[PDB]
Amino acid sequence: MVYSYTEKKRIRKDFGKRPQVLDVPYLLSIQLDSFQKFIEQDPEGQYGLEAAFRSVFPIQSYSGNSELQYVSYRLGEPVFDVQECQIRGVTYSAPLRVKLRLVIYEREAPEGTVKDIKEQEVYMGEIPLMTDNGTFVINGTERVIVSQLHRSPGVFFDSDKGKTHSSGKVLYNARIIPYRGSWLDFEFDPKDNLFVRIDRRRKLPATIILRALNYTTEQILDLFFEKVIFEIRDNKLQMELVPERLRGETASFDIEANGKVYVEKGRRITARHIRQLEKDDVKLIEVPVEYIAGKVVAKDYIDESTGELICAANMELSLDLLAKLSQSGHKRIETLFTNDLDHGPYISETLRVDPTNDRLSALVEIYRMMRPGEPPTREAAESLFENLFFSEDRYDLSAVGRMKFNRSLLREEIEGSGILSKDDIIDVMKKLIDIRNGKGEVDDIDHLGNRRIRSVGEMAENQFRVGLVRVERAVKERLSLGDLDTLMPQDMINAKPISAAVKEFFGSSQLSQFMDQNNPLSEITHKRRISALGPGGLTRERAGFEVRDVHPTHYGRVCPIETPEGPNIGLINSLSVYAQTNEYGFLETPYRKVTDGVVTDEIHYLSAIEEGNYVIAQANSNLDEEGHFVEDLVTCRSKGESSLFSRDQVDYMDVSTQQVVSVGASLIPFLEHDDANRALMGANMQRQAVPTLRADKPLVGTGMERAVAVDSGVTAVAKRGGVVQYVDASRIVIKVNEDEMYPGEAGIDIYNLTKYTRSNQNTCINQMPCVSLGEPVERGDVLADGPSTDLGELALGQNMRVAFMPWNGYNFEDSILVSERVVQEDRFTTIHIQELACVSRDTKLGPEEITADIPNVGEAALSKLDESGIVYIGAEVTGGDILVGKVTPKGETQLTPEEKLLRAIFGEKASDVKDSSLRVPNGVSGTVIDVQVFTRDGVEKDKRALEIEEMQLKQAKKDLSEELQILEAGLFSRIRAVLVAGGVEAEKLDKLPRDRWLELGLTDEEKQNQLEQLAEQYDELKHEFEKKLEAKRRKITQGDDLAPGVLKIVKVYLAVKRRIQPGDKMAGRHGNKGVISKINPIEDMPYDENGTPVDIVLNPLGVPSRMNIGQILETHLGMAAKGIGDKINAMLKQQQEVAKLREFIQRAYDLGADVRQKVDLSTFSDEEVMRLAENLRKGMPIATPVFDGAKEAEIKELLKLGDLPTSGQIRLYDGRTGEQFERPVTVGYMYMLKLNHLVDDKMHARSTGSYSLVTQQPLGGKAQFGGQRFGEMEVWALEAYGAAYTLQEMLTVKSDDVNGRTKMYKNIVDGNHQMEPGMPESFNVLLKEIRSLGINIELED
Amino acid sequence: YQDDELPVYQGETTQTLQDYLMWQVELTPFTDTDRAIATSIVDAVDDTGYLTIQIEDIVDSIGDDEIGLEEVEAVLKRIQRFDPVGVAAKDLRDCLLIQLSQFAKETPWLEEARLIISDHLDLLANHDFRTLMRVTRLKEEVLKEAVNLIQSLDXXXXXXXXXXXXXXXXXXXXXXXXXXXXXXXXXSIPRLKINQQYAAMGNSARNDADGQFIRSNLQEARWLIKSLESANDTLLRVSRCIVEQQQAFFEQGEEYMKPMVLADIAQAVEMHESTISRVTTQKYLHSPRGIXXXXXXXXXXXXXXXXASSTAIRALVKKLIAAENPAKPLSDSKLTSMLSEQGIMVARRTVAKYRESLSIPPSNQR
Amino acid sequence: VPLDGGRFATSDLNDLYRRVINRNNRLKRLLDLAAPDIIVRNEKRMLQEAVDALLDNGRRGRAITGSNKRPLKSLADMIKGKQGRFRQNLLGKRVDYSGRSVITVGPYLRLHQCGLPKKMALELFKPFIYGKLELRGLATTIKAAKKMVEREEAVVWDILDEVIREHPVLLNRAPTLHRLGIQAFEPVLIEGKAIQLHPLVCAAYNADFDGDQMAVHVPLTLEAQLEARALMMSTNNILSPANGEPIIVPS
């Protein structure tokens, strides 16, 4: 335990205090999981290639009876690896093999085929592959794609907030949104009528859209309403009783029931009389006539004598109609309830809005009402109805639409057809009215349970589907006139829409951009990101208010801390450490089951809807040995709230406390002691850190750095470890142990470490061996460390000794002062790498050769150039020196003696060729690293291109011969065994070459078996390794693909060193970013009683205002951190015995209460104690978890172990006057960071640059020499001062005056200092732009 | 950070900078007429900056009214020094004379030889020295540092230039050979025209106006689409048909070339000559040789019944006169007889001009 | 502005002219042809939409390009900039001699002075440098003095010291609100890549030092130096014209 083979070198101290149930996962897995979902064979139809294949296929031409049947698919092996394909600048992809067969139906026969043709498929498209590090390599780029955040398809009931007409009326609408196709919306107007909006068109009533569903008015009222039974016959005039349906009522007359009084006139409507009359059983009783005039007939009743009828529905009656309907002979007439308390009259007004009760008519008004164009032909109405409404291809809800659709309606089935049925939208309408009736709740938009994310797999599947349908459109047309086509699955498929669709999506998009190469943490947080943008998207500006606010469902899924500030606030987010994604695309978070009074160790992942109903315990809570709670009242959360609950009322447990913080902010110790916004800045500034020469371990830390560094994929992870054989800077090999081995071929592990290589930000990356020799390796090891990594631990910055005071007022506001010692020690130094390219192209005048130095240039620049005009490796190029020369011929020379005389003295070219060359720009100084030049097939390479081929061939042969050497090593071992078995000549047997001629015949069995088998193995391994070496050599040298117009490409790399300077722009992880005002010498820095000056000094003024207590705690805990290491170092200066050092180390690690760290000495025997001591000589890596920290008692005790003053303050003396400062001073060690922002590129100071051809103004860009900008508020200010000439020179002469330039400059050279203003050209531009219009403007004399 | 469509904007190209001599004269402290005379001088400066017109033509073109040549001459010599080591003055002597005046003003054997070599006998000493070594009185290799110093003396101007217009062909039309057939596959093909029509079709139904705009927005757009997609498809089909006709009709790999009347290639597709000959003007061809769909359509009767036009003859004639003259024949008629021995029926009178043409040293190589 | 990669590039507003002239030549060629009235009415409508789309892009047909889509631009949007005067005129000009560096703060350089980087120098003052090089007789031709500046001889540093001594240089920040955001100070050459600003004046800029950049301008001629020295000197004006309570007060 607690080994890992790295950790035995250096131990971290953890304060613990709470256990961790589950380990941190791979944490990139979900990303790869998406890729793992895109490529696989799924018979069930899961999202991937098979879903699009079964979606588009089978395909058939119209009335041609020809079908195509696709069967599965297959993927081939890439032509290159990651390294070589990244170096050559070629995209990294894989071939696509998807088989399909052609079937020709029989002519003029039912359900028959004359012949079927199954042949091999044609090569189409290229599908890239996601690297093990999680990047998509295209054109030599990292190209990390960010996941998308959007709303899930389904039904959304919205209250809209109820403010529309200002009259204070609530309006409940709803939106059914499918996955693809037209969106359907239902809305209420203040008129209290139902209206329908289809694809944001004009508002139409809900009756005209339902009328096309073949529901008659009687079926509409009978289906969508509950009619009360009423019958008036023989003057009785009685109705049925509705005690439960009728609550409140107004009685205008006495109501008696079965001869007994029931409700008196003006009687109380309270539940007393309702229950009194409800207890007794009363049949239908008579009522007065006045109650009928308020009722409305539901169904359509006709007289039995004659055929005519009265209207349809939604029409009241009169006292004169009772004679007609009573004389007609109708015994019973069903009428709707006509009672408004919770319910109310609806849909009646909508019936009154439109005349059309019929499918044909309503189809006409919906057709012509939608499309402004050609009126309906009665074909277009049905074609747009069936095509735009539910259909197989156009309308698909699939799993999210059907699942959320059935869940919103409380339906039992979780699946169904991909299209809506007739009763589905009717149910949406019934519940939709039920929301207005007062029953039900309004779903929130910001609620995450309805908010779904997508990944690269589903989007790439969508684009591949769009391309495959785009081809499917063209395939159907060629099958009609094709008749019999030999080898049909060959030329009938074009790969241009496929490779162009997927190559266009991966190549260019707003969700696919360059990965940040600075630090591994910026890579991890770059690969894990949430964005509301994308194809459905939320673009910007709009929809940005409530949505940006924090919602309680964001607790254990997205980190509230990390987010950019000004533009993107509330949009970009970061997932939690333990957060994962469901198969359906929903985020869940784990919990810990609690049964009875004990807490079970099993975990259960819950979603928002699942966790909302149950109760989850608070993060920090005590525990017992059996798992019982110490306190009865436990803080918990039920629904959207928090409060105390009983020990038996809590369902689950929060497990770890870090579930609410992402990986970037998980490296901030004592997060509770810093402000929320300042920690938001601290997590942002730590991602911009630039790596340096040597990474120093942080004294104050967390312990998440290990999983971040090993899971970032930057370092070298050792697989199937074993005894190390050979080590080296660029190569490390390991001999695998015999325990885990694959039978046959033997072989050992080889590792090629990545040397200095250009970045996207121009920085450098490197790897160095962490092991020496003769030590084993366990699986899951770290062989090398990438940039800003130390022994597998992630150190992205360098510690310093902080002193808090002002020093002679040199620190002002947030600024900082640095000692010269930091500059002398080389700390805070970075290296950049710049790529330079020169192209040679074939023009109209013929090819452009690169050779024969440069014309019209002295030998000064020619001495540095050779090998066809390229610089040597290791040369230092400064200034405007030409790195690569080039000659472009010009053949326009004709005749006259001046040409012959010009060619007499000089000859050769005689100035017929231009001097254009690479021409390295100024402001760049450094040496050369690598020559990347690419050449063309059959262009007769020559030059130096053969040297790199000899290097690659020598390397491939050198590292290739090792495995073979092992092959005949073991082979000669076995042959040695069989020759020693009998007739052993001892050393003489090894002295004779060629296996001593196979030891003659020896025994007969070995002569017919062992000898021929041994020679067969020798010839097989020999010729096999020679064949593989020849194929590899043929693989090294290959013609590089390039454009038909380009001839040859030259690329050379440069390196530049950058040292710390007053430009500064440093930062901490607590949100503190200063600048360097002055660099003081060591003599001027304050020193303690021992004479040790402080390295860095900060201003305390920012501590109370910015509310950062983690800084000071980091300084004191840094003192207690380094003091112990100084004790071990002081003990090692005297070469103390292993016993005393063992007692001091063991006494050092076991301190503190609890901390649940059981690591202890008296285990490692002899050495490895002195190794870890020599490792911790510099300092002790104390690790502090995020939400579990240390305390003042632990800091003071651990500090008193180092004999340091408990108050954390030490006396200091002045470095100049030497006087003692009044009051003590807090000293410490804080972790310091450098930022990519430097004054090297931020200084310009333009004098006279190039001018634009339009408006005669300078440009704005640096390098191309921008003149910055002079704005409107500046003219406002200069008008506030009242200076006419100071602004007058800047408005005209310095900008828009053509003659003011030359004449002004001429007056300045002579020293006249005369203005002589002139007329601006931009005003003339405005003049002409107005003159183009019919408006005339003219100056006056 | 891609900013959607990207800048894609007019941009106001800032390069220009053909001649800065105007900005140089603008800073020269002239009085009154010297500025106008200087502007008259700088206008006649050639792009090469070696020999510019005639000194008398300037003065005759000034509209003198006195202002004799003694002034404008001092303006010449005056600007030539402020020039980048020199400009114009022609004569081919004044360039090297001014370049050596302010360069050094000392070294071993600079001015002593430079004055006589620059003054006279230069053109006589350009080919070889020989007897001139006895005229200059120098002994053996003493002049090696002199002429060696002149070699570095060097077109006098053309230092600034700054002409980014390199004029590249790029793609255009391509052909390929394989499986025993060197047949072009029309190896361009953006497909944008094809793609745009397909893509634009989606665009027509995307107005989202509610005005329908069936009369103007819908029919006109459709017409434009038919009009541009049909025109691009017809142009691409004509270019592919002409590229295939010229491909199959003549083979580049085979030695020599076959003359094609404009009519034979026009008679293959049965199209008028002007239509195809106009298509072959600005359209080039890219194969794995050289770098035009115009030089491969050269027509000539070759003036013989036994065989090809002039391209084959011209290449052959330069391949003949290339290696020849072991001694110093310096002969064109002998090349016309050797060419006549193959049955080409060369006149041998106009043969030299053809042979001489296009950088050939003949007949001045004698 | 033809590009070598894209051959001849055409502006979005250029196609409107060839479109209106195209439909105009169609209407004129088809007019005298003596054709039915429906076709010539359709031609009048197409030309009407063409001219109306040329003058005003917004509303109406809002014609869309095939390749780049977008509404493109018409004369109404091409007036100036944003369809204001702001971008290319009315204080939209970039002038010259501007800023672009970081600001620092020393506890020296009296309140009328500011540290000017010596590398930031030698460039803004090039006209003065050439003037004094031609005045003192150390050179003759302008190109010779240009080579002397490019070779940065030690004498050029002394002459530059003579130039910068009393020559004022005015400072301004990027989001200037009140008038005190832009002032005029006396430069003093300092060794470094940044500018040292007086601390007490920083409160007038309402900024802090995180490494913020700045804007710098150099007045030319003469009267501009008198308007900078007599007005924008922070030693000349203290009381802010808002409260009347003093500013630059230490903190």
Added chain:
Amino acid sequence: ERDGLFCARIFGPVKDYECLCGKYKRLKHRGVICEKCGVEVTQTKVRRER
């Protein structure tokens, strides 16, 4: 092209004082009409004026 946008003749000469079809190159010829077209000599800054 003649009679077109930014055409020669009207709107001014394209390059320096040169004229079409190689006539009246520079300098002493100012007021004049070219043989083939109405091209005249100008500083070429008139492109904005016309």
Added chain:
RNA sequence: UGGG
């Protein structure tokens, strides 16, 4: 994407 990022800085005030």
